[PDB]
Design a protein around this nucleic acid. Structure first.
Ligand SMILES: Nc1ncnc2c1ncn2[C@@H]1O[C@H](CSCC[C@H](N)C(=O)O)[C@@H](O)[C@H]1O
Lengths: 237, 321
RNA sequence: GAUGUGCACAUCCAAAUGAGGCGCUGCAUGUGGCAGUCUGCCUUUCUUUU
């Protein structure tokens, strides 16, 4: 596997139990806010956010189209809680059907808000990045910077940060948690392109805090509140 | 003695392969018995099985191991062995006697189950389903106890243990609930939908593309060629360095081959218009491919996957709108 | 996840699954399918302890 996609760590459990992260974050920014989530593998974090904080909408996005199928298996796992042997649920599938809304219906009920879309977020061209429009209120980009970095260089990484600047509405924030520099070298021999772009790195994980403040992207102010957790604010109104 | 233990292991494996259980379940060895005169089989056939290979390859030591034995007999030479007790119909009580067990530690061995269940009752037959021949236990097992009282004892003795009939009833309940949910949602999708000789031969439409690098995918080539003219077919083998394109009008093919800017400078390709014998052979290839795709039977797709893909796509459409 | 050397270098392993078995239509179709068929049916399963 090249992109960092793991089919592992599947979760039977409902939102009540989560994989650590959610005690760190604060729920104040989520409520009544459109959210994009980059680098989600099965949404074990995405569903467990949407389950309690009640975000108005939440679109997870991942590159592995094979794995978003298992994310949708995990979303249909919650509806069918209405014991059963695991040998049968492994072979058939979960009981419930994929919850489709009526035309006249009430959103923001779990799970009717969230949808999982498969796509590639790095468009590789600055002209396509400049054409985009703001659509979201909070963007989560955590544990992603390493793999996009090694796969598409500082060119694709600049393209991704310039796209995240284009998709925030005014008042919309960015959450970040980057992988340190010490890790990358253990993954250099996976393919040829990863090794070449690893020996073509000119940008360190520290100067991220410089580069997003730089006018080439345009984020206005930032803070870190306790790998670190960075909060970036676009300028108000 | 170790030789004594190997003789005992040969005796146990032969008495299991000739026990009532494995003779009722396995069909191959029962056909080996049935397709003979006087009901026999050579020991050399028994050597070829996988678990016999770990113990002994000498057949005379096997014949010595079958001297003192409950149910097997030998005729003259110690090279053939017969059942010694005639077999009839399958018992009905075994379906009630069967025990289903769940949550295995994933180290699967026939001796593993025999150790953990042998103290409770006489274990006679084990079924462990392998992960599609990947040599991995799926995580559940079927253990058959004898005389149907020890099975009811072992259910009380215990990592998740239940009967066969209770498993079958839970299976029917599960399957009926999924059929009801999918029937209702099938009706919902139907209500939402309710409320809301082949190609003609044209000369000069065949563009052959030769490349130094291997060609990108058919979606990439189709997006490349469709943005300039109207494409009818992209003939492209995965991994080939050459490909073909069939277009609607020859003016479309002319607009493609005169698109030196958008094609040949971006991708190191040589695109020409085939004519004459090359075009005739290519249209014969079109006819052969059409007759082949027609003569092929239709691909099979499961109904539940098709229905869940349709519902997923309508979910994305109604959320984006 | 582990190993050798003095957290650093080098090497090894990554695959915690789900689409696995088999059809019927009635239209299209080198166009890479579409609409149905009880969720199309079945799964202890594409199993050799032959
Ligand atoms: N170019 C890209 N654009 C968006 N997502 C990508 C991407 N390349 C890789 N990814 C995804 O990023 C994921 C990082 S794994 C990170 C764990 C996840 N955030 C969690 O909390 O559970 C991978 O699963 C990979 O599929």
């Amino acid at each position: 596997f090249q992109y960092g996609n793991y089919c592992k760590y599947y979760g039977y459990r409902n939102p009540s139990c989560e994989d650590g992260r959610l005690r760190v974050l604060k729920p104040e920014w989520f409520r009544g806010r459109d959210v994009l989530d980059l680098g989600c593998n099965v949404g074990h974090l995405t569903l467990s956010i949407a389950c309690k904080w009640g975000p108005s909408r939440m679109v997870g996005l991942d590159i592995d189209s094979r794995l978003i199928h298992s994310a949708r298996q995990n979303i249909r796992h919650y509806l069918s809680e209405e014991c059963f042997p695991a040998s049968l649920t492994a072979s058939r599938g979960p009981i419930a059907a994929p919850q489709v809304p009526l035309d006249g219906a009430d959103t923001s009920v779990f799970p009717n808000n969230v949808v999982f879309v498969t796509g590639n977020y790095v468009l590789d061209r600055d002209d396509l990045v400049e054409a985009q429009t703001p659509e979201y209120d909070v963007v989560l980009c955590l544990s992603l910077t390493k793999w996009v970095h090694l796969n598409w260089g500082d060119e694709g990484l600049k393209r991704m940060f310039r796209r995240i600047y284009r998709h925030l509405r005014p008042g919309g924030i960015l959450v970040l948690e980057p992988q340190p520099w010490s890790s990358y070298g253990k993954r250099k021999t996976l393919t040829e392109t990863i090794y070449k772009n690893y020996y073509r790195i000119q940008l360190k994980p520290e100067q991220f805090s410089s580069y997003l403040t730089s006018p080439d992207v345009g984020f206005s102010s930032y803070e870190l509140v306790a790998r670190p957790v960075y909060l970036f604010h676009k300028a108000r109104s | 003695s170790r030789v004594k233990q190997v003789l005992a292991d040969i005796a146990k494996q032969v008495d299991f392969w000739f026990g009532d259980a494995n003779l009722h379940k396995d069909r191959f060895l029962r056909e080996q018995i049935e397709k003979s005169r006087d009901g026999y089989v050579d020991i050399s056939l028994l050597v070829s099985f996988n678990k016999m290979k770990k113990l002994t390859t000498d057949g005379k030591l096997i014949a010595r191991a079958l001297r003192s034995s409950a149910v097997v007999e030998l005729d003259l030479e110690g090279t053939r062995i017969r059942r010694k007790k005639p077999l009839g119909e399958r018992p009905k009580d075994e379906d009630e006697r069967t025990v289903y067990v769940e949550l295995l530690p994933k180290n699967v061995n026939h001796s593993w189950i025999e150790r953990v269940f042998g103290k409770c009752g006489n274990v006679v037959y084990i079924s462990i389903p392998h992960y599609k021949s990947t040599g991995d236990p799926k995580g559940f097992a079927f253990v058959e106890f004898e005389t149907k009282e020890q099975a009811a004892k072992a259910i009380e003795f215990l990592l998740r243990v239940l009967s066969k009939s209770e498993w079958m009833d839970l299976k029917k309940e599960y399957l009926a609930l999924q059929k009801a949910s999918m029937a209702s949602l099938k009706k919902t999708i139907s209500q939402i939908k309710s409320e809301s000789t082949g190609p003609q031969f044209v000369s000069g439409v065949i563009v052959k593309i030769i490349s130094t690098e291997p060609l990108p995918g058919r979606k990439q080539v189709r997006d490349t060629l469709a943005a300039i003219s109207e494409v009818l077919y992209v003939d492209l083998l995965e991994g080939d360095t050459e490909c073909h394109a069939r277009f609607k009008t020859p003016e479309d093919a002319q607009a493609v081959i005169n698109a030196y800017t958008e094609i040949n400078k971006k991708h190191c390709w040589k695109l020409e218009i085939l004519s004459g014998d090359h075009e005739q052979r290519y249209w014969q290839k079109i006819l052969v491919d059409r007759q082949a795709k027609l003569n092929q039977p239709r691909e099979k797709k499961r109904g539940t996957e098709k229905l869940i893909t349709k519902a997923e796509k309508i979910r994305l459409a109604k959320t984006q709108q």
